[PDB]
Amino acid sequence: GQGPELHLASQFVNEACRALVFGGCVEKSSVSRNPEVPFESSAYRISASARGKELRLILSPLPGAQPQQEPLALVFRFGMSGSFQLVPREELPRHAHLRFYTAPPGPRLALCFVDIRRFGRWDLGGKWQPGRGPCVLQEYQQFRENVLRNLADKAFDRPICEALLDQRFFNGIGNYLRAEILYRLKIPPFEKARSVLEALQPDLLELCHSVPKEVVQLGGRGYGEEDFAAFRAWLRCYGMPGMSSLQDRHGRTIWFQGDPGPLAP
DNA sequence: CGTCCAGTCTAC
DNA sequence: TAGACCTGGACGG
């Protein structure tokens, strides 16, 4: 997922878990190479926040819960195929790698981290990844300043389409968002990043916020196949007929219209 | 059947 | 930088 999907997943966890109470341990599938979550409580609540391409779960025991346990935080990266589902406890999806089980009273549910390809990761810390820049959705002013104050960095020597995937400066931007952002300003994707940005100190850094915010305001992204059609209708550039495509230097497809730009392969 | 396609992470 | 990490759906023979 990209920023909008991480944000919608966190909203899903908060709304779906608002009136739920979890109990017992945190179950990992046997094939996941991610760490076991050392947590048990008779009664805990689950809440979430997103920052960029990361999601933080907080496991919060209720007053009196046993064993003695302090709130525990988990940070998830989704990779290519990560998501959260709330499912009936005996109808786990195929790739449910981490599960939180509702306590009784009511229907036994499992909140699941589901990840087909297992490119997703989680850490016990609760800390955001060091080196990831601020969230383009929730920390816009910090994100904007962190870019404009470090244009000398060699990251900005690269084509703008490659720079937009660098999570130290554009935390939350992925493949579809870089195409949609550049399409709206008709910036050639192989323009030098430093050239497009030096001329800024509604612009490119503004769209790094407002474009992904549009995806959030659609809602959906899992969180029927109606909001999947809603998304495909919103896309103007990524994968669309009449658009060009090239491989960047890491073999990721950039969709665009017209001029490929000077640093084109 | 087969090939090809859809975000980090790390060994060179 | 190139390869690794993985599964499944769309498509071709």
Residue numbers in the entry: 2 to 202, 223 to 244, 249 to 290
Please give sentences taken from the publication describing this entry.
Human endonuclease VIII-like 1 (hNEIL1) is a bifunctional DNA glycosylase of the Fpg/Nei family, which catalyzes the removal of damaged bases and subsequent incision of the newly generated abasic sites. Unlike traditional enzymes which are commonly referred to as highly specific biocatalysts, one special feature for hNEIL1 is its unique capability to recognize a wide range of substrates, including formamidopyrimidines, hydantoin lesions, oxidized, and dihydro-modified pyrimidine bases, derived from all four canonical bases. Here, by integrating structural, computational, and biochemical investigations, we show that hNEIL1 uses a triage mechanism to achieve broad specificity and reduce futile repair of normal bases. This mechanism involves two mutually competing interaction states: an activated state that commits catalysis and BER, and a quarantine state that temporarily separates and prevents the flipped base from catalysis via auto-inhibition.
For a naturally existing hNEIL1 variant (R242)14 in complex with dsDNAs containing OHU, Sp1, or Gh, the damaged bases are in close contact with the guanidine group of R242. Such conformation of the lesion recognition loop resembles that in the hNEIL1-Tg structure, where the positively charged side chain of residue 242 is contiguous to the solvent-exposed flipped base while the aromatic residue Y244 is laid away from the active site (thus called “242-in” conformation). Noteworthy, across all these structures, we observed an unusually short distance (~3.0 Å) between an outwards heterocyclic nitrogen atom of the nucleobases and the terminal nitrogen atom of residue 242. While repulsion is expected for the two groups if both are fully protonated (i.e., an −NH group in the nucleobase and a positively charged side chain of residue 242), we previously showed in the hNEIL1–Tg complex that hNEIL1 utilizes a tautomerization-dependent mechanism to recognize the flipped base. In this mechanism, the base undergoes a keto-enol tautomerization event where the originally protonated heterocyclic nitrogen atom becomes a hydrogen bond acceptor and hence can be hydrogen-bonded to residue 242. The fact that different recognition states were crystallographically captured for the same edited hNEIL1(R242) variant bound to different base lesions suggests that the flipped nucleobase per se also contributes to the stability of the interaction states. hNEIL1 repairs a diverse array of base damage, whose aromaticity and hydrophilicity differ greatly. Oxidized substrates of hNEIL1 are often bulky and contain non-planar structures; this disrupted aromaticity is expected to diminish the π–π stacking with Tyr244 and hence destabilize the quarantine state.
